[PDB]
Amino acid sequence: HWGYGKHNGPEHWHKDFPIAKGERQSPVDIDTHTAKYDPSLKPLSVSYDQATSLRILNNGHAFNVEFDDSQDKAVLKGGPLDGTYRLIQFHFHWGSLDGQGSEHTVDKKKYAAELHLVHWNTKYGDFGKAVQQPDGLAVLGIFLKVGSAKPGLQKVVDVLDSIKTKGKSADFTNFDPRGLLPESLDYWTYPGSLTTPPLLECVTWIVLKEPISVSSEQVLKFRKLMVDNWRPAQPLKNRQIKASFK
Ligand SMILES: [Zn+2]
């Protein structure tokens, strides 16, 4: 019965998922002066040109745009990663007003929303096998700030009315996730977890420094589905956040 409310929200999750109090939980606050520049980190390779979106699902906690991951189409490689990770889905976290919504924070600053592009390591059989492994997933995190509209988000926003109800899905083919990426691929990276139950510690996080801008109208349409589906920042503990820059 986990969710984001007073009675079932993040502070309760540890009861059903004790790893919630574990050693590599996400999200975290990215303290830009404690983040360590690592010259050995390679540039990120985001290869999304042959992405095949299939559908969009309201899973009760967010909406997921799902991709065909049955062969290498949209993949993430390079950066802190060893090998190739296939895009399986993306989703967002957002708030009930503009001053909150992101999961990661940067020097304690919260953005209005955060996009997670979820990828699994093709050394493993499928996503299900990958989440059982400490290097199973790579999640590309992108902050959303409110200002100008992101044109490449409009197709997502426009279909949401058709999946207002929990559990419903819709066909969602031929969406190009390249339209959700900022100019720069400068990033921070650290080992962490899924930010929703079961909170498995299987993720290499790659959080981009440059946010994308979305319009007030765009985020307001997210909110017609639910609000405040973000887990707050968890302690960094015995980890270091590394930066691809400065
Ligand atoms: Zn997420």
C-alpha 195 to ligand 1 mean position (Å): 6
For the chain, the domains span 1-246
Bridge partners, 190 (sequence order): 205
Q: Which two tokens mark 155?
A: 């197709």
Tokens of 205: 């996080």
The answer as to CATH 3.10.200.10 being correct for domain 1-246 is yes
Q: Is 91 assigned to a binding site?
A: yes
CA 157 to chain centre: 17
Q: Would the annotation count 116 as a binding residue?
A: yes
* Angstrom resolution of this structure: 1.3
* Distance of CA 54 from the midpoint of ligand 1 (Å): 19
- Give the dihedral of Cα atoms 152, 55, 76, 134; nearest 10 deg: 130
Give the residue numbers marked as catalytic: 61
Distance between CA 216 and CA 227 in Å, rounded? 15
**Alpha carbon of 49 to ligand 1 centroid (Å):** 23
Solved using:
X-ray
Instruction: Kindly give, in sequence order, each residue whose CB lies less than 8 Å from that of residue 234, ignoring residues fewer than 6 positions away.
Output: 25, 26, 27, 28
Question: Token pair 């967002």 is at which residue?
Answer: 92
Q: How far is the CA of 92 from the centre of ligand 1 (A)?
A: 6
Nearest 10 degrees: CA dihedral of 74, 80, 83, 86? Answer: -20
CA of 91 to the centre of ligand 1 (A): 6
Whether residue 93 is annotated as binding a ligand: the answer is yes
User: Is 196 known as a binding-site position?
Assistant: yes
